[PDB]
Design an enzyme around this catalytic site. Sequence first.
Site, PDB file in Angstrom:
ATOM      1  N   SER A   1       3.625   2.990   8.130  1.00  0.00           N
ATOM      2  CA  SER A   1       3.315   1.915   7.138  1.00  0.00           C
ATOM      3  C   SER A   1       4.478   1.269   6.357  1.00  0.00           C
ATOM      4  O   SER A   1       5.362   2.326   6.199  1.00  0.00           O
ATOM      5  CB  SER A   1       2.279   2.352   5.869  1.00  0.00           C
ATOM      6  OG  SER A   1       1.201   2.698   6.420  1.00  0.00           O
TER       7      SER A   1
ATOM      8  N   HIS B   1       0.613  -1.273  -0.100  1.00  0.00           N
ATOM      9  CA  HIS B   1      -0.004  -0.138  -0.070  1.00  0.00           C
ATOM     10  C   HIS B   1       0.713   1.305   0.042  1.00  0.00           C
ATOM     11  O   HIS B   1       0.200   2.463  -0.268  1.00  0.00           O
ATOM     12  CB  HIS B   1      -1.019   0.020   1.102  1.00  0.00           C
ATOM     13  CG  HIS B   1      -0.699   0.489   2.233  1.00  0.00           C
ATOM     14  ND1 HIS B   1      -0.216  -0.457   3.414  1.00  0.00           N
ATOM     15  CD2 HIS B   1      -0.726   1.838   3.018  1.00  0.00           C
ATOM     16  CE1 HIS B   1      -0.020   0.551   4.370  1.00  0.00           C
ATOM     17  NE2 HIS B   1      -0.240   1.752   4.263  1.00  0.00           N
TER      18      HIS B   1
ATOM     19  N   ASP C   1      -0.518  -7.526   2.169  1.00  0.00           N
ATOM     20  CA  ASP C   1      -0.017  -6.063   1.875  1.00  0.00           C
ATOM     21  C   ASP C   1       1.587  -6.073   2.120  1.00  0.00           C
ATOM     22  O   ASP C   1       2.178  -5.965   3.208  1.00  0.00           O
ATOM     23  CB  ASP C   1      -0.663  -5.207   3.099  1.00  0.00           C
ATOM     24  CG  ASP C   1      -0.209  -3.657   2.900  1.00  0.00           C
ATOM     25  OD1 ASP C   1       0.152  -3.249   1.810  1.00  0.00           O
ATOM     26  OD2 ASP C   1      -0.411  -2.954   3.872  1.00  0.00           O
TER      27      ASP C   1
HETATM   28  C1  M67 Z   1      -3.889   7.187  10.227  1.00  0.00           C
HETATM   29  C2  M67 Z   1      -5.335   6.804  10.872  1.00  0.00           C
HETATM   30  C3  M67 Z   1      -6.444   7.154  10.010  1.00  0.00           C
HETATM   31  N1  M67 Z   1      -6.605   6.271   8.548  1.00  0.00           N
HETATM   32  C4  M67 Z   1      -6.961   5.233   8.864  1.00  0.00           C
HETATM   33  O1  M67 Z   1      -7.374   4.623   9.824  1.00  0.00           O
HETATM   34  C5  M67 Z   1      -6.899   4.392   7.453  1.00  0.00           C
HETATM   35  N2  M67 Z   1      -7.483   3.061   7.663  1.00  0.00           N
HETATM   36  C6  M67 Z   1      -7.468   2.201   6.449  1.00  0.00           C
HETATM   37  C7  M67 Z   1      -5.789   2.025   6.385  1.00  0.00           C
HETATM   38  O2  M67 Z   1      -5.215   1.797   7.644  1.00  0.00           O
HETATM   39  N3  M67 Z   1      -5.068   1.981   5.201  1.00  0.00           N
HETATM   40  C8  M67 Z   1      -5.380   2.264   3.654  1.00  0.00           C
HETATM   41  C9  M67 Z   1      -4.054   2.480   3.420  1.00  0.00           C
HETATM   42  C10 M67 Z   1      -3.667   2.026   4.989  1.00  0.00           C
HETATM   43  C11 M67 Z   1      -3.013   2.820   5.811  1.00  0.00           C
HETATM   44  O3  M67 Z   1      -3.687   4.027   5.932  1.00  0.00           O
HETATM   45  N4  M67 Z   1      -2.008   2.683   6.658  1.00  0.00           N
HETATM   46  C12 M67 Z   1      -1.547   3.700   7.409  1.00  0.00           C
HETATM   47  C13 M67 Z   1      -1.728   3.214   8.996  1.00  0.00           C
HETATM   48  C14 M67 Z   1      -0.857   2.622   9.506  1.00  0.00           C
HETATM   49  C15 M67 Z   1      -0.997   1.925  10.918  1.00  0.00           C
HETATM   50  C16 M67 Z   1      -2.123   2.067  11.480  1.00  0.00           C
HETATM   51  C17 M67 Z   1      -2.556   1.876  12.923  1.00  0.00           C
HETATM   52  N5  M67 Z   1      -1.566   0.725  13.297  1.00  0.00           N
HETATM   53  N6  M67 Z   1      -3.220   2.595  13.746  1.00  0.00           N
HETATM   54  C18 M67 Z   1      -3.217   3.078  10.968  1.00  0.00           C
HETATM   55  C19 M67 Z   1      -3.034   3.665   9.640  1.00  0.00           C
HETATM   56  C20 M67 Z   1      -7.869   0.922   6.718  1.00  0.00           C
HETATM   57  C21 M67 Z   1      -9.248   0.911   6.839  1.00  0.00           C
HETATM   58  C22 M67 Z   1      -9.910  -0.349   7.301  1.00  0.00           C
HETATM   59  C23 M67 Z   1      -9.948  -1.311   6.069  1.00  0.00           C
HETATM   60  C24 M67 Z   1      -8.429  -1.386   5.608  1.00  0.00           C
HETATM   61  C25 M67 Z   1      -7.776   0.001   5.516  1.00  0.00           C
END
Ligand code: M67
Lengths: 249, 27, 10
Positions: A198, A43, A99
């Site tokens: 990420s 991603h 991923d």
């Molecule tokens: C950065 C927090 C706000 N963004 C999100 O929560 C984005 N959420 C999506 C998400 O995390 N991503 C789409 C690209 C990827 C991403 O944004 N990764 C960054 C990220 C890394 C770690 C965490 C964590 N461990 N809290 C959260 C977001 C997921 C939603 C549910 C279905 C799967 C995808």
Amino acid sequence: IVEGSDAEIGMSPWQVMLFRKSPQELLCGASLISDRWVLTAAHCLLYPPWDKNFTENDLLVRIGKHSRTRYERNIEKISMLEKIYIHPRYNWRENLDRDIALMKLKKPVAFSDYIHPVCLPDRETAASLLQAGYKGRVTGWGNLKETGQPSVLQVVNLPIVERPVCKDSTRIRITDNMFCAGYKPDEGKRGDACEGDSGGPFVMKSPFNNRWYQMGIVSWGEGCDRDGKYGFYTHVFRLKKWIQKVIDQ
Amino acid sequence: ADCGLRPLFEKKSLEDKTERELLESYI
Amino acid sequence: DFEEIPGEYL
Ligand SMILES: CCCNC(=O)CN[C@@H](C(=O)N1CC[C@H]1C(=O)NCc1ccc(C(=N)N)cc1)C1CCCCC1
Ligand SMILES: *[C@@H]1O[C@H](CO)[C@@H](O)[C@H](O)[C@H]1NC(C)=O
Ligand code: NA
Ligand code: NA
């Protein structure tokens, strides 16, 4: 990293920064697995919902770093990408299943006190370490909070969570290619990966041979460090056959 | 090979400040 | 806020 600490110098020498050439910015974390191969989350490179589709020439890999923004003269090494390999069954449409991506460097990186590869687990390493309650370590230069940016590499130690508890925390479908980690609201302790982390590594130190193994890749979450929610990681061992196939060539 | 052995820690027999927390969790 | 990197890295 939310609710982490500044890393010590040389604490995570496999830590890689994926750096966007224009505009000059942090793209993602990543990890050094050999003198020529870098492991990250697919991603970071391909994510159609956000119009993300980076090619080799769009970025640089910065190895041996500690400071987020400074050019660490005589310490960090900057490498160019020869080729990107994204898992052919990476699921960006739904839940980021598989991923994972590999990046081949144009030239081998010279190892130093600050640059050194992490191990990849074998079947027994994974069976012995990937247990609910066992702690791993996550590192990155990502957001300090969900809603800001650190001066140096951040570190957090987090426990692996039972699969039913991971499943019950979210409406998203969880696969065998993922695991979740973080503290429960009852544990008092906090911590999580966040945006910009990420692609970074979730590592564990084997008590058997005293070596660090990359068990996970920072993949996704819903917010950062929210109570009752956990960080999701790509299960490196489950995807090792693909890793090996790409490296064998 | 020498994967996962840090030049500034394992190679010198020096421990980082929180690695004991990981070891203590491997019950 | 990123410090410029040597030109050799493109
Ligand atoms: C950065 C927090 C706000 N963004 C999100 O929560 C984005 N959420 C999506 C998400 O995390 N991503 C789409 C690209 C990827 C991403 O944004 N990764 C960054 C990220 C890394 C770690 C965490 C964590 N461990 N809290 C959260 C977001 C997921 C939603 C549910 C279905 C799967 C995808
Ligand atoms: C991503 O970029 C390449 C151009 O390098 C293109 O061939 C490809 O179809 C694009 N989109 C996806 C979803 O792979
Ligand atoms: Na659920
Ligand atoms: Na949480």
